[PDB]
Write a protein that binds this ligand. Structure first.
Ligand SMILES: O=C(N[C@H](Cc1c[nH]c2ccccc12)C(=O)Nc1ccncc1)c1ccc(N2CCN(S(=O)(=O)c3cccs3)CC2)cc1F
Ligand code: HEM
Length: 442
């Protein structure tokens, strides 16, 4: 009962190169040419079955670890999160560790986040956008605000003195540049010559050492993310080692650094284009009554329109293209069976362009709704739904409201940028993100 297979021209590659040159065109072509939302491609040539029919999403996002296993596709993350941590730990321990982190990012921790985010955005604009007008790279400035604001929400004063946002961002960038995403499926790529020595193992040790000194200094005489993590207790009564705590801190910062940056950038590139003037007017009608000091209720409860803006930016250009699982027990999807040992995948990129669920999918329409229930999967669904999503939305909406209150923006090109599918987390093409800001005062 197998899904149809896309023909393979080069057995050793399968489709990894066709996918890589244009994942959107490739995946739409398969789904169109095989006349099936559910179809199988080759990635060197491991079978990957894509559930590209939004009616079948729950069949991918609902099964538990025993049936659909996430960990096999993250072997590359081991040197980053740390040996034996997270995806390299036994499953019950992994679930507990991700859950400790989820607990640090609930509503209940957010009471002082909105002013901390605002103070930091404002400091960034005063320092970097200080003429009446100027030309910036919006994607780079969003990245800087996202790291700065995250640090101010999650890290205590003492930790920020040993490790400012700029040094944090350099450490994460070192750990990131060592990764070969395609090594998930072709681990021999790890054997190819590097232009430069990898600094991942060293960036992490350096972070772990700073964290250890902060911890010793705190014991000599604390409710930030580090402190929350230090009070966590496994069900067997033991606690996290420093190795583990460091792994979780890395995962939390690493997860949001591109995804959140990209979401903010897209939302601003859309809002500022002149054809979207009606939407920018609507955003202003939402925010123009707010006090200068926003609070949690303003952002969580009184920005429904800004949130539709953020969601629609992820719908149109989801920063995570594909989510994957090892099939541990055969599963039904639609009228097919997907066999044990396949990789199964569901792609936000593909599903978010399904013509039935999202008519005119290349149009950014913040007022649209999904026409297939559950077809938006930008933050996942079910068992592995994103645990960072409320924090990421708070952050992005808070930056929108803060920047648009004091500045106007002009995109220096005819159209909202093209997505650049060549990076593992996908955002607007970098050299298309030049923007002129105009300070409203002066
Ligand atoms: O950015 C990625 N991951 C990173 C690191 C990461 C991994 N797992 C996590 C779990 C929790 C937190 C972080 C991570 C990441 O930040 N992911 C992430 C997940 C959830 N929320 C926010 C961010 C990422 C992005 C793409 C990707 N691939 C792997 C395989 N290929 S490929 O060429 O071999 C291919 C396979 C199938 C079609 S093409 C494509 C890119 C692999 C990746 F790990
Ligand atoms: C806009 C920002 C984000 C986007 C667009 C996004 C996207 C996603 C997606 C698509 C999934 C599903 C993964 C799957 O089904 O395999 C997911 C899960 C997850 N995300 Fe995010 N994410 C974002 C921000 C964050 C942040 C800030 C964090 C942590 C600080 C985070 C941590 C996680 C974790 C721990 C999981 C679940 C891992 C699992 O159960 O295997 N995300 N996210």
């Amino acid at each position: 009962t197998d899904p149809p297979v896309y023909p393979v021209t080069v057995p050793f590659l399968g489709h990894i190169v066709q996918f890589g040159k244009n994942p959107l065109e490739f995946m739409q072509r398969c789904k169109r040419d095989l006349k099936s939302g559910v179809f199988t491609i080759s990635i060197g040539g491991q079978r990957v079955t894509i559930v590209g029919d939004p009616h079948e999403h729950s069949r991918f996002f609902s099964p538990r670890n025993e049936i659909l296993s996430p960990r096999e596709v993250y072997t590359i993350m081991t040197p980053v999160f740390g040996e034996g941590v997270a995806y390299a730990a036994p499953y019950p321990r992994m679930r507990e560790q991700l859950n400790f982190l989820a607990e640090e990012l609930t509503i209940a921790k957010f009471q002082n986040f909105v002013p901390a985010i605002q103070h930091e955005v404002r400091k960034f604009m005063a320092e970097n956008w200080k003429e009446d007008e100027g030309v910036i790279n919006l994607l780079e400035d969003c990245g800087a605000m996202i790291i700065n604001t995250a640090c101010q929400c999650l890290f205590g004063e003492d930790l920020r003195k040993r490790l400012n946002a700029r040094h944090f961002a350099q450490l994460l960038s070192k750990m990131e540049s060592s990764l070969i995403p395609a090594a998930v499926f072709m681990p021999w790529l790890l054997r190819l010559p590097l232009p430069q020595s990898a600094r991942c193992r060293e960036a992490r040790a350096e972070l772990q050492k700073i964290l250890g000194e902060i911890i010793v200094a705190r014991e000599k005489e604390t409710s930030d993310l580090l402190g929350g993590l230090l009070k966590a207790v496994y069900r067997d009564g033991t606690r996290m080692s420093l190795h583990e705590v460091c792994g979780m801190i890395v995962a939390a910062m690493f997860a949001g650094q591109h995804t959140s940056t990209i979401t903010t950038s897209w939302s601003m590139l859309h809002l500022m284009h002149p054809k979207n003037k009606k939407w920018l007017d609507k955003l202003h009608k939402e925010i123009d009554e707010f006090p200068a000091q926003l609070n949690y209720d303003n952002v969580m409860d009184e920005m429904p329109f800004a949130e539709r803006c953020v969601r629609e930016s992820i719908r149109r250009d989801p920063p995570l293209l594909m989510v994957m699982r090892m099939v541990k027990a055969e599963v039904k999807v639609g009228s097919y069976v997907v066999p044990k040992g396949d990789i199964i995948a569901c792609s936000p990129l593909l599903s978010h362009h399904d013509e039935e669920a999202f008519p005119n999918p290349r149009l950014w329409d913040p007022e649209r709704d999904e026409k297939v229930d559950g077809a938006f999967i930008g933050f996942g669904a079910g068992v592995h739904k994103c645990i960072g999503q409320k924090f990421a939305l708070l952050q992005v909406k808070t930056i929108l409201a803060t920047a648009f209150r004091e500045y106007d923006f002009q995109l220096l090109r005819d159209e909202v940028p093209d997505p650049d599918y060549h990076t593992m987390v996908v955002g607007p093409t970098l050299n298309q993100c030049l923007v002129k800001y105009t300070r409203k005062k002066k």
